[PDB]
Amino acid sequence: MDLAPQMLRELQETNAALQDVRELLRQQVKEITFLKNTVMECDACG
Amino acid sequence: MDLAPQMLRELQETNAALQDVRELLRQQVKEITFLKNTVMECDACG
Amino acid sequence: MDLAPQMLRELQETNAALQDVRELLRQQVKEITFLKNTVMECDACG
Amino acid sequence: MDLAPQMLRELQETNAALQDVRELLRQQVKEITFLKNTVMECDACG
Amino acid sequence: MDLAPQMLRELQETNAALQDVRELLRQQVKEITFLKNTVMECDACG
């Protein structure tokens, strides 16, 4: 019945949030790759 | 007549959980960004 | 009527999954915050 | 009304994908904790 | 009924984003696995 319009707003907010997890992950991937790079060039390690 | 309310509830339950997942990531990012800086300043490497 | 009970089962499983993912992240953040503190006190970096 | 069969598909796919993300997080923490244990007994930091 | 279709757009969208999150993670894990193997191969630790 009248519950359908909100089901939409919930599926609307489940995408707004996921969109944010989508970019914060792609950021963390870059930061990690970078973290990896600094270690590859670590004289202390050899 | 239908299971619409039980459905509406699960949806909003997916959101509240996504709320926590979104926050844990934001925090985890400040941590990996901090970590990354320490090894760039680490005397032992370069 | 046919798939409605099935659209509820899946939703409930979406949260069960997201429930473990939610508690899985909590542990990852802490391990990562421990690794940071550890690296910080590292007597070779500073 | 018709649209339930197609909506069910998208949900089963949602749980198949999430099904993978769950295990990925279980392995990511697995090695994060090994990375921890590694820097702790690391004779450079002590 | 009236909005049934609009709910299908959102679901399909969460699927797409899930694939993105998914493939981002299999990469982040691929990287963290390297960082682990590398710190283990660090001569500074011994």
Ligand SMILES: CC1=C(/C=C/C(C)=C/C=C/C(C)=C/CO)C(C)(C)CCC1
């Ligand atoms: C994609 C998505 C799901 C959420 C997945 C998340 C929130 C994955 C988070 C993974 C984390 C970020 C990994 C951190 O290393 C939900 C269940 C809402 C259903 C449909 C959309």
